[PDB]
Amino acid sequence: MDMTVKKLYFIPAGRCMLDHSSVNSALTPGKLLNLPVWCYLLETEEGPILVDTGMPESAVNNEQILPKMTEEDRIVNILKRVGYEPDDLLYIISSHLHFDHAGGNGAFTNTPIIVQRTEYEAALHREEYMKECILPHLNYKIIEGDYEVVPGVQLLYTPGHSPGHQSLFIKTEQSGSVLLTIDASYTKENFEDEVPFAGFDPELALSSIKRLKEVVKKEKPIIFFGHDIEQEKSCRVFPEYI
Ligand SMILES: [Zn+2]
Ligand SMILES: [Zn+2]
């Protein structure tokens, strides 16, 4: 039997202000949304695993897209609070390399950073990628498609929102099956109702959602969305875990 993840921690990593048309492509632009930024910490048998690394420190007190980030929201300060130094981490998982998911990746210079090849290669070329998110000499562990990280921790390839976006399917000891969509769906309605949202390839984003729905049919997991203001406040967050 595969081990489950001992603890899954949801960690607030600051916020990001966007036009409301980013959670619903049909909306008349002109209203602001203040979205939560997340990272996740997985305690496993072989060691702690961090999923995403917050915003780049150039966003600290430095707000189309307006980062709302304090010093406390820097990944190493998050790491201090959880009780680890970067080198304690078994793996870093980058769901993708957008600035609000990979901006702290430079803090981890020894830990393998799991990233999809299509994401990594896009970040080497596409304009939307900040250098903080694609530093050249980190220990990248480049994968393609679905991948088991450690027993209990699986990566589901869900491109569309970005060229190589990936989501997480986790089994925890306390909660059983958990799906973290990350940016494969910002909100429940992006997923449930297939309300269109911001992305590199919306058509591919839809098929990724359709694939996740096949997984949900079979596994019936609890699902946590990437930037969901409605779901946010009833999540148990660090120091609590699920
Ligand atoms: Zn994104
Ligand atoms: Zn995001």
State how far the Cα of 230 lies from the Cα of 27, in Å rounded to an integer.
18
> Mind listing the domains of the chain with CATH numbers?
1-233 (3.60.15.10)
Ligand closest in space to the Cα of 166:
1
Q: Which helix (H) or strand (E) holds 144?
A: none
Q: Please tell me the distance between residue 215's alpha carbon and the centre of ligand 1 in angstroms.
A: 22
Q: Please tell me the distance between residue 5's alpha carbon and the centre of ligand 1 in angstroms.
A: 25
Q: Please tell me the distance between residue 43's alpha carbon and the centre of ligand 1 in angstroms.
A: 25
Q: Please tell me the distance between residue 130's alpha carbon and the centre of ligand 1 in angstroms.
A: 12
State how far the Cα of 19 lies from the Cα of 26, in Å rounded to an integer.
12
Technique used to solve these coordinates: X-ray
Q: Is 37 helix (H, G, I), strand (E, B) or coil?
A: strand
Ligand closest in space to the Cα of 36:
2
Q: Please tell me the distance between residue 102's alpha carbon and the centre of ligand 2 in angstroms.
A: 10
Tokens 């909306």 — which residue? Answer: 27
Tokens of 235: 């999540």
Report whether 101 belongs to an annotated binding site. yes
State how far the Cα of 112 lies from the Cα of 87, in Å rounded to an integer.
10
188 Cβ contact partners less than 8 Å away, ≥ 6 residues apart: 223, 225, 228, 230, 231
Amino acid identity of residue 213, one-letter, is K
Report whether 98 belongs to an annotated binding site. yes
Question: What is the sign, positive or negative, of the torsion defined by CA atoms of 159, 98, 108, 117?
Answer: positive
